[PDB]
């Protein structure tokens, strides 16, 4: 695991590279203009899409209203289900 961490990358780069070469491919990236917040990006059927992902002062990450210990506890359990719930896009890496 951990093949999904790309760090410094921006949205404009992410939408470029992440179209290679399968739907459900994903990367995790920072807000380079002001560090400490992050984005998930994913390959979808019309292009590439993005999702803001954060942590609290409690040192716990969140996506919804519910908290998890790291983004690894999101990704490793979210992967069996859709990021959209209206499209067949699920997180996958080979």
Q: Which residues of 41-68 are buried (b: 16+ CB within 10 A; e: fewer)?
A: bbbbeeebbbeebebeeeeebebeeeeb
Report whether 36 contacts 50 (CB < 8 A).
Answer: no
Which technique was used to obtain these atomic coordinates? NMR
Q: How many CA atoms lie within 13 A of 42 on its CB side?
A: 20
| Segments of the chain assigned E as strands | 5-7, 26-30, 38-44, 47-55, 61-62, 67-68
Residues in the chain, total: 94
Q: Which residue has the tokens 């590439």?
A: 48
* Distance (Å, whole) CA 3 – CA 72: 11
Encoded tokens for 36: 């400490």
| Prior bond of 21 cis (ω within 30°) | yes
Question: Which domains does the chain show, CATH number per domain?
Answer: 5-78 (3.30.505.10)
* Distance (Å, whole) CA 71 – CA 60: 9
């Amino acid at each position: 695991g951990g093949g999904w961490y790309y760090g410094r990358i921006t949205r404009a780069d992410a939408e470029k590279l992440l179209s290679n070469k399968h739907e459900g491919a994903f990367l995790i990236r920072i807000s380079e203009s002001s560090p400490g917040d992050f984005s998930l990006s994913v390959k979808c059927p019309d292009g590439v899409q993005h999702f803001k992902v954060l942590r609290d002062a409690q040192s716990k990450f969140f996506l919804w209203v519910v908290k998890f210990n790291s983004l690894n506890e999101l990704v490793e359990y979210h992967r069996t289900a859709s990021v959209s719930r209206s499209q067949d896009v699920k997180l996958r890496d080979m």
